[PDB]
Amino acid sequence: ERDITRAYSLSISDLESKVKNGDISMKEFVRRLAKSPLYQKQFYQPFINSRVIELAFRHILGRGPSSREEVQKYFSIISNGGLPALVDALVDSAEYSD
Amino acid sequence: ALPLLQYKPSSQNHRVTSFGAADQNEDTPYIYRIEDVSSYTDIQNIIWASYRQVFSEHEILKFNRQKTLESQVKNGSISVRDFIRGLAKSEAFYRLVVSVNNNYRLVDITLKRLLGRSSYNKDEQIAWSIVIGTKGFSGFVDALIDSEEYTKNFGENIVPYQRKRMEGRPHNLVTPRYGEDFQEKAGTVQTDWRFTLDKFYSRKSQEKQLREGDPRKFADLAASVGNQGNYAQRISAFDIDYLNAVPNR
Amino acid sequence: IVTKSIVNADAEARYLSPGELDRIKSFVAGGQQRLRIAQALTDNRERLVKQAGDQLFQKRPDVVSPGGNAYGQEMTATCLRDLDYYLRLVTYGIVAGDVTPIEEIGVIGVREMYKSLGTPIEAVGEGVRALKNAASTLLSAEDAAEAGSYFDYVVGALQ
Amino acid sequence: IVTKSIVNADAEARYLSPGELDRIKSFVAGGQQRLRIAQALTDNRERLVKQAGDQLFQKRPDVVSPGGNAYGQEMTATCLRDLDYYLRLVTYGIVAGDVTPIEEIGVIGVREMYKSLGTPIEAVGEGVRALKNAASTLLSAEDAAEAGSYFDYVVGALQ
Amino acid sequence: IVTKSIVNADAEARYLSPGELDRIKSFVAGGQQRLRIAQALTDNRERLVKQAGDQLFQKRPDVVSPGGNAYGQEMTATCLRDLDYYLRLVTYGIVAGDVTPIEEIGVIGVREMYKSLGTPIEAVGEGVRALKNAASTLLSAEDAAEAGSYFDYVVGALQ
Amino acid sequence: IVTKSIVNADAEARYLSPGELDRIKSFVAGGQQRLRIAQALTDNRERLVKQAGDQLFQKRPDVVSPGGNAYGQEMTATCLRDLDYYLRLVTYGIVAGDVTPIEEIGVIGVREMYKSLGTPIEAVGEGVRALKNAASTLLSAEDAAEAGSYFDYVVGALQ
Amino acid sequence: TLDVFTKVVSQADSRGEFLSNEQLDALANVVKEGNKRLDVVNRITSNASAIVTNAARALFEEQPQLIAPGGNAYTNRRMAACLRDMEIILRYVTYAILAGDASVLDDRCLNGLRETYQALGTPGSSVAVGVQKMKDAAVGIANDPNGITKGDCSQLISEVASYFDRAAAAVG
Amino acid sequence: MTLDVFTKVVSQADSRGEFLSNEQLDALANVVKEGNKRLDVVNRITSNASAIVTNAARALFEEQPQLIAPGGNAYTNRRMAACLRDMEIILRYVTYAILAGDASVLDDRCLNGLRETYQALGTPGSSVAVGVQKMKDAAVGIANDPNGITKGDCSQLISEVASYFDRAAAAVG
Amino acid sequence: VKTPITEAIAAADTQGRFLGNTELQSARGRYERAAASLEAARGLTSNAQRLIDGATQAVYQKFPYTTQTPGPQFAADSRGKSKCARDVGHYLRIITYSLVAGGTGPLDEYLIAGLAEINSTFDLSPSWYVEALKHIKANHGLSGQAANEANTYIDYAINALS
Ligand SMILES: *[C@H](C)[C@H]1/C(=C/c2[nH]c(/C=C3N=C(/C=C4\NC(=O)C(CC)=C4C)C(C)=C\3CCC(=O)O)c(CCC(=O)O)c2C)NC(=O)[C@@H]1C
Ligand SMILES: CCC1=C(C)/C(=C/C2=NC(=C\c3[nH]c(/C=C4\NC(=O)[C@H](C)[C@H]4CC)c(C)c3CCC(=O)O)/C(CCC(=O)O)=C2C)NC1=O
Ligand SMILES: CCC1=C(C)/C(=C/C2=NC(=C\c3[nH]c(/C=C4\NC(=O)[C@H](C)[C@H]4CC)c(C)c3CCC(=O)O)/C(CCC(=O)O)=C2C)NC1=O
Ligand SMILES: CCC1=C(C)/C(=C/C2=NC(=C\c3[nH]c(/C=C4\NC(=O)[C@H](C)[C@H]4CC)c(C)c3CCC(=O)O)/C(CCC(=O)O)=C2C)NC1=O
Ligand SMILES: CCC1=C(C)/C(=C/C2=NC(=C\c3[nH]c(/C=C4\NC(=O)[C@H](C)[C@H]4CC)c(C)c3CCC(=O)O)/C(CCC(=O)O)=C2C)NC1=O
Ligand SMILES: CCC1=C(C)/C(=C/C2=NC(=C\c3[nH]c(/C=C4\NC(=O)[C@H](C)[C@H]4CC)c(C)c3CCC(=O)O)/C(CCC(=O)O)=C2C)NC1=O
Ligand SMILES: CCC1=C(C)/C(=C/C2=NC(=C\c3[nH]c(/C=C4\NC(=O)[C@H](C)[C@H]4CC)c(C)c3CCC(=O)O)/C(CCC(=O)O)=C2C)NC1=O
Ligand SMILES: CCC1=C(C)/C(=C/C2=NC(=C\c3[nH]c(/C=C4\NC(=O)[C@H](C)[C@H]4CC)c(C)c3CCC(=O)O)/C(CCC(=O)O)=C2C)NC1=O
Ligand SMILES: CCC1=C(C)/C(=C/C2=NC(=C\c3[nH]c(/C=C4\NC(=O)[C@H](C)[C@H]4CC)c(C)c3CCC(=O)O)/C(CCC(=O)O)=C2C)NC1=O
Ligand SMILES: CCC1=C(C)/C(=C/C2=NC(=C\c3[nH]c(/C=C4\NC(=O)[C@H](C)[C@H]4CC)c(C)c3CCC(=O)O)/C(CCC(=O)O)=C2C)NC1=O
Ligand SMILES: CCC1=C(C)/C(=C/C2=NC(=C\c3[nH]c(/C=C4\NC(=O)[C@H](C)[C@H]4CC)c(C)c3CCC(=O)O)/C(CCC(=O)O)=C2C)NC1=O
């Protein structure tokens, strides 16, 4: 939600060298950028899990939760598997890939 | 206008006779005399050593030298005592010493250079500091060279020198042309980084570094206030006689 | 003084009555004299704290005495710092034109503070009286009157 | 280093794996040597800033030169205050055992700060290198290694 | 440290030991820093003595109480002169490296003396502790360890 | 500047909006003045590198000094070759009308290159400032403004 | 001896740059206000002797033990001593308004003043009660308009009074 | 005071009040042979006296370059000339010390009150002794010369000369 | 230091009297000329970088051996040319300093004091610097009475050189 370089100048310079080439695509790059130590310090560590779900809906899907059933299922998923399970269940979806 | 306040003179080296002429060491200075001419090397040495006392060697330079007063000295039109007045009442000396130093320190620096003695106490420096203020600096330099301690010891035709410093540091060397209180204003201790290191841990920086608040900021004000309170009363509490102490109506 | 009239007309449902507008216009006119008085008290602060400590420790020597609170250099420095604080609040009240921003910071809970610090309040009142006398000597007649106004408020408040 | 393992096992849904418990037990064992190293760097702060300013202004004279930033007594005092700040953060990182509470206060946005202050960052890196050399002279071998650890992190961070 | 080493090698039949000659060499090497500490303490005589005495009267008001010994201007002046004497002996001990000047000028018979003067010993000791704290705040850090440890000898030997 | 508008309208699914067509038509109109400015900077290159080295080595003598990078004839020849490179990229940016083909070759990774070469970047910025001053003396007013445009971009980029 | 013109040189030498254009616009206002500065200076020196005794009608009337037997202004030489240097305050304050900067005043007038005033035994604080009485009479003369074209010299009046406040601070 | 090798072995011999021993006269006899070598050696310093000072000033100011840059205490032109006059006065009295053979004439002029003025003025005192060492590196390079002089062992004499500079740097720093 | 406002002070201070109309009159004169002197300061400050490299390459013309002879003093090496623009650039600073001061004081205290001592030791011939200053006084482009104003202080540095 704000550019981490030009503003703080700290970022992963490891993954840019693969996205510039074409080793991992953007759906792979967003996945490898979310389950990262950089994203956890700003969005997974301040907020409760129910707010983390909505912020990871905004960061990846670009929208807010549409129904009660949606947050029930995604809370169960983040509950049983941490943040990388939520990132994997969010990046792989039908709403993302369409 | 007003006469000098009486000041106490401390005991120094030069108030003493020091008998004899053939007995003093080598290290008494060469008492260069315009009456001894015999050559131009003596003429140039008399000019150069008269600059030595006045400008402490390093300054003589080229520009500071007043060439017309040295033009005159060779001719003999003006005495050496008149010639030191030309060097001392010169604004090439004013910018060098007089503006830069203080009226209390100027008394100390011009007695070592024109009379060749350090001031006895601070009361002597206090005494002449008034004579500087109302008559001006050249009025005071006139009063030093008119003074009878000058004419008795040096005379009309002898360049000054330190009288009897048997075991003392040389006066052009122990005293600069400006002291430490003025040092920030003429010197460059502000911009040199070597001194700001010393300053960083100085007790004066810790009074500056504290934020607004603390009574250590007002600790210098608390010493100037004074007015300490009286002690408790000596008289014993028991006698007081409290039952008959109350006044009716 | 504008907040005073605003909350005064604000407790009522009415607007600001134009007599209050007249008093605001007159305060706006006198603000330049207020600013000059405040700057004159501003630049000469350490003289005023020096003469206040002078007149106080000449008047009451028990703070100097070791049973009193202001014994030693640290405690007497804290004492003159308190007098500096009160001079600062007096300059604030001189600019604001009404004693609200000085009572809000120096008056409203001062008795229990000085009671649980051990210091007597009458000596603080005598210190502000000494500040008023020194500022009366520092200023002109119409300036010393208008400064002794707020100094008088502080002296009445500390008692 | 405990917050590191806790958020590390907290991103996962698993507990703290007992190898992480072993590293916490070992850090708990080494904490006494960490505290002695931090106190030795603590009490000798004046000396380290002096020798760091010595070696820096001998190495780079442009901060001394009037085109540079640290020209004059005020700017050179701010320079040695910056070196004091970095020594303080190094002692914090020595106690904490991992470079998070020192990077959070001194590293994470330092390049744009020093860019919009005009100062070069390489001179700051040379200053922390001089601090590392002076602390290497101040400490024993196993202490200077473990101090030059975090000093080395700061020197790599400022570049 | 030369007198003590000589009398210790005098009690034996042998010369000065290589260890003791290393002690004398290290004492010579530290002697210039000890002269610097003596320079600072000589030039800070006034304010150190006054701050320590007023810290004593803050801690112990019994001496300046009217039942106490230091009641009155002359008695309290002699109190400050006693603190001056002890600070002078501390400077002598810092210069010499021995405590034999401190001892045979001001320690050896002080209990019987202050018993016959009516003066409490512990308040003297608290005043010298206040001197230790003040001179510790004035000097450099491990330099203050050096000065305060001689002060510590005086404090422990008075009680 | 055509690639800028094309990728700008290409991220969107819309066509090129006709205001962008107006800016392309205006750039097409100004291209003749751009070509004359570029040829005037082209034919006079060695004068500009000479005066830039003049003003730089008068401004910063540490590159001349043996601790600096540009010490000796080989290193100073590499220095003037770097200034020649930057003048060449400035002519490219003058023709292209927008700073993309000059930032792509000279700006986008320059800080880490000059950091791992040892040279300071501020001296390079002063060199491009000297190039801007010499080209401002070489050109007319409306030409020096439009050249100092891209020179100004390089000076802001190297800092 | 420094100035307004020379002090903005002396810090500009210490940084080693050319003088900026807004410093020259600052000095252009100093020249512009120069005529006003001169007028104020001439009125002080023409009423210089009238100020000192009129300050001495209150310096001694307010603290009347000073000339009473025992005080340090008692005998006649001692009385002429605090008129021989009451005017030296005016001799150097008028030099400060002429130069426009208090650096001339600090070097001679107040550098050693607070040291002699405890060496002699004179009350140092009893000077600055009457230097304030000089300032009350100095700015009363410098502001009053008699046979003068109307003008506003208010800025000078406040920093004329700043030189007296510096003259009272280093004695008290 | 002005003392010598010849006069200092008198002055302590007066304080003990005895006649001069024969091994003190054999010590002074060694000195007479040494003196001829010294005169030749000391003439080389004074003939290259002005060449040393500026060649030390090509490094005294190049190594600490803020000193002549605006702000330093060697910045303006009389301040720059101030240093040169003093710099040669080190050579003016070190050459007096090698002539007398004892540093007792050196310690009254360059070592007596010099460290007091150098904090009163505001000059860096430690920035003198970086360049007096640069004088010593050039002084013993000239004195130890294989050209124009019959080879004689001057190593014994050289050591005394080198030290006088170290005494000249110790009381300023 | 030497200034017409200072020269009024140091004259009246050594007499021990107040400021008469004769010291005060002198100050009045300075203002009329100080209005045209600050015109000369902006004319040299704005054209500063053209004038320095205009000068240090003019001295290389009349003295071509100075870039060829291998010597520490000589400017043939780049290090000399770096110290070329420093030294000539120091001159335009002090000339602009003595313009706004109105007197020759900053010129007398910063530049020419002890200049005969330094040029003898480092063998810098003073014929070099006088050739640069003749280029400055002819190429500053100043006009009117301000053109007279810079022309005195440049020529005052010329006479102190020789
Ligand atoms: C030179 C490397 C550094 C330096 C020199 C410098 N010194 C002064 C001022 C003085 N120097 C002396 C020195 C001596 N006086 C003595 O009698 C002797 C022994 C015979 C010596 C060595 C003294 C007394 C002064 C005070 C003034 C005087 O010249 O008489 C200056 C001028 C500084 C000034 O005028 O304020 C300079 C430049 N300073 C440096 O910058 C170099 C680091
Ligand atoms: C961890 C293992 C690993 C490597 C090595 C790696 C290399 C790598 N090097 C690249 C480019 C490059 N690599 C080089 C390197 C070189 N060319 C030369 O002339 C030299 C011989 C050599 C340097 C020693 C250069 C010059 C480019 C730039 C090509 C370009 O981006 O236009 C690219 C293209 C995109 C990018 O840099 O960001 C990749 C992915 N990726 C990896 O994940
Ligand atoms: C008017 C007040 C006053 C006094 C007293 C005074 C003393 C004075 N005594 C001196 C020396 C001296 N004074 C003595 C004195 C003594 N030796 C002994 O054994 C005795 C105990 C003692 C005399 C009773 C000696 C031996 C010297 C010479 C020391 C030397 O040159 O090393 C000197 C240095 C040389 C000189 O005489 O000029 C002065 C100035 N000056 C004054 O203005
Ligand atoms: C701006 C509003 C404001 C007020 C009013 C204020 C009072 C104040 N006075 C204090 C102490 C003190 N105040 C005094 C006061 C005095 N000396 C005397 O004898 C007189 C009775 C009186 C002044 C002449 C003394 C002696 C202390 C130190 C007492 C102690 O250390 O226990 C302290 C505690 C120490 C400190 O943090 O400064 C506070 C907070 N602080 C504030 O921020
Ligand atoms: C603890 C985290 C922390 C950092 C890192 C920090 C940096 C910091 N450095 C500053 C200034 C400064 N910093 C320097 C730095 C240097 N001198 C040099 O030449 C070198 C390049 C470098 C040190 C050797 C200088 C010269 C200034 C003053 C610059 C100015 O005044 O514009 C300032 C502004 C003035 C101030 O408020 O202190 C900040 C905030 N502050 C912080 O709280
Ligand atoms: C160099 C070694 C040395 C010491 C220590 C010393 C002490 C000393 N303390 C004295 C009195 C005194 N000393 C004190 C001391 C104190 N008040 C207290 O309550 C405190 C505990 C203590 C302050 C440390 C007082 C109150 C008196 C006056 C008692 C009297 O006059 O009867 C006296 C008698 C009057 C005099 O000659 O000054 C001596 C000799 N003399 C020495 O030569
Ligand atoms: C067109 C894009 C482009 C850039 C920017 C570039 C920079 C560049 N600068 C270099 C060296 C250099 N660059 C400089 C730079 C300077 N002298 C100084 O003092 C100043 C700081 C600065 C110029 C005024 C120096 C001194 C060297 C030689 C350093 C060395 O040999 O280690 C080198 C290595 C040697 C070489 O192969 O030329 C490269 C590649 N090359 C490029 O192709
Ligand atoms: C240029 C700056 C300058 C000043 C101001 C100065 C003052 C000064 N005033 C002095 C004495 C004096 N100062 C005064 C003044 C006063 N005493 C009083 O009773 C009044 C309260 C007060 C005047 C308001 C008197 C009466 C004397 C003579 C005292 C004596 O002779 O003991 C003295 C010592 C003797 C002297 O030479 O006359 C000095 C040095 N000196 C300086 O160089
Ligand atoms: C050195 C000899 C000398 C003096 C004394 C002098 C004064 C002087 N003051 C002037 C103006 C003036 N002077 C004042 C001064 C003031 N007006 C007020 O109401 C204020 C209270 C007061 C300042 C505190 C004013 C207001 C003017 C108006 C004209 C101007 O701005 O110069 C002028 C303008 C030209 C003229 O009047 O003919 C002169 C001559 N000129 C000289 O050559
Ligand atoms: C005061 C005027 C004066 C001078 C200058 C002087 C010098 C002088 N040096 C001499 C010898 C000498 N001087 C030296 C000196 C040295 N050889 C080395 O290789 C060393 C580097 C260096 C000493 C550091 C030597 C080795 C000799 C050989 C002869 C001898 O022992 O005297 C001699 C012997 C007689 C002669 O040469 O005719 C003279 C004259 N004599 C004078 O009357
Ligand atoms: C603030 C006023 C000011 C000026 C201007 C100044 C000049 C000045 N230039 C010097 C040397 C020098 N000056 C030059 C300049 C030149 N030589 C040439 O070949 C060219 C013809 C010419 C330049 C156009 C050079 C190359 C040196 C070094 C010479 C040497 O080291 O022997 C020196 C002696 C050594 C030094 O500290 O660097 C001084 C004092 N000093 C001052 O305080």
Side-chain angles (χ1 to χ4, degrees), chain G residues 35-36 38-40 42 142-143 148-153, chain I residues 21 24-25 28:
Chain G
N35 271 16
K36 296 185 185 63
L38 293 186
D39 186 356
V40 170
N42 173 68
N143 196 320
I148 199 185
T149 68
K150 303 193 172 187
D152 293 350
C153 281
Chain I
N21 202 34
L24 273 182
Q25 293 188 354
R28 165 69 180 179

Side-chain angles (χ1 to χ4, degrees), chain A residues 26-82:
Chain A
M26 185 61 54
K27 170 168 108 191
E28 194 66 37
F29 165 63
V30 158
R31 166 190 277 139
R32 295 182 76 94
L33 185 50
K35 42 181 211 180
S36 66
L38 197 148
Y39 175 87
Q40 283 163 31
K41 283 174 204 159
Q42 281 177 18
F43 286 96
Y44 191 70
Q45 274 171 50
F47 310 113
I48 198 182
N49 279 120
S50 284
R51 189 62 196 184
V52 163
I53 283 160
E54 311 155 3
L55 287 187
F57 266 43
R58 190 207 162 161
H59 296 336
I60 308 182
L61 305 187
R63 54 107 182 163
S66 317
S67 57
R68 170 78 207 275
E69 178 62 49
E70 188 89 15
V71 297
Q72 287 173 2
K73 174 173 80 172
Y74 278 87
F75 197 98
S76 290
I77 292 176
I78 190 180
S79 296
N80 285 332

